[PDB]
Amino acid sequence: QVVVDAVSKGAPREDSTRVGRRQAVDVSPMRRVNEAIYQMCKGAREAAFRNLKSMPECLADEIVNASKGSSNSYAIKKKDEVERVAKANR
């Protein structure tokens, strides 16, 4: 349940691409499951790259902090950066 709560919060609901200017575009529910899994495996991988911590700790920390919606997770820093850029590129 902590993982399903981490996947559900891990990816941005909105994003911005050039469709014609840089218009804000909605994100499908399929990609939101893809990009949540992608950005948690990423970032936990970069945490443990030259760290004392093992990979099952760095992966366990990204899943927990994204499950709580904390900004300590790598994904939630990028989930909030994309949504505020999408809110300004409307």
Binding site: L52, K53, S54, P56, E57
Partner: protein
């Protein structure tokens, strides 16, 4: 920098037997930066606490061993 000790001082081994059994989610990397000791000591210090039953072994593999406090 990250200069870790390679053997226990008498001060920090007393930290090993007191504060570490009070933690939840003990791993040899949690102990390595809390107690500033190398993981080769931290893993050796935690195998000692299992045979004294102060901590619990909740998950074991050849590389990764995860420990927890015993609740009684």
């Amino acid at each position: 920098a990250l200069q870790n000790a390679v053997m226990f001082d008498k001060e920090t081994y007393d930290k090993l037997r007191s504060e570490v059994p009070k933690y939840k989610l003990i791993t040899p990397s949690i102990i390595s930066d809390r107690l500033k000791i190398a993981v080769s000591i931290a893993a050796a210090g935690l195998k000692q606490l299992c045979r004294e039953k102060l901590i619990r072994l909740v998950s074991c593999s050849s590389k990764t061993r995860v420990y927890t406090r015993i609740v009684q």
